[PDB]
């Protein structure tokens, strides 16, 4: 029920993430003087798609822990703690949002 539509949604998202992965990868190729094979790009796209699942489940856990059903910048900050570099980066970004 809604299963076929969900499969279409999944293909839509895979392809969207893949496009964006291509664009970002191209910036990197330019920076470093390399060429990424199609298969490499696709691989990174699929890895990224998959990691999204854990991000989403952890964000949801973090919001629930706060008796809160909507995810905020505090949950994303928590999500980024385990990598100090990442935490600094994303916290910078988040403050930048705060200023508006």
């Amino acid at each position: 029920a809604g299963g076929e539509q969900r499969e279409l949604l999944i293909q839509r998202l895979r392809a969207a993430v893949h496009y964006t992965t291509g664009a970002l990868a191209q910036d990197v190729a330019e920076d470093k003087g390399v060429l990424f094979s199609k298969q490499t790009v696709a691989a990174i796209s699929e890895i990224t798609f998959r990691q999204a699942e854990n991000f989403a489940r952890d964000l949801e856990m973090f919001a629930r822990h706060a008796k809160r059903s909507t995810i905020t910048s505090e949950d994303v900050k928590l999500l980024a703690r385990r990598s100090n570099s990442l935490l600094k980066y994303i916290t910078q970004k988040s403050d930048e949002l705060a200023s508006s």
Partner: protein, 75 residues
């Protein structure tokens, strides 16, 4: 460029185990940044691995080689 809000939102809702779970706009932008960093990191690491082997071309093998460390080092 970067990940679009719509894409990130749908991507996240897809995996929520609670129907009422939502993500506000700031979190969506933040997550877009986080995902972008993830991708740039995967690409930069695979690139580095290929360069240390004196290759211009990054192949799926280079990605596979760098992935576990990446996932470990990432969140």
């Amino acid at each position: 460029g970067g990940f679009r809000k719509e894409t990130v939102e749908r991507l996240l809702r897809l995996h929520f185990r609670d129907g009422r779970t939502r993500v506000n706009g700031d979190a969506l932008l933040l997550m877009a940044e986080l995902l972008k960093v993830f991708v740039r990191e995967a690409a930069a690491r695979a690139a580095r691995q290929a360069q240390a082997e004196d290759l211009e071309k990054v192949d799926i093998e280079h990605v596979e080689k760098v992935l576990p460390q990446l996932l470990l080092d990432f969140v």
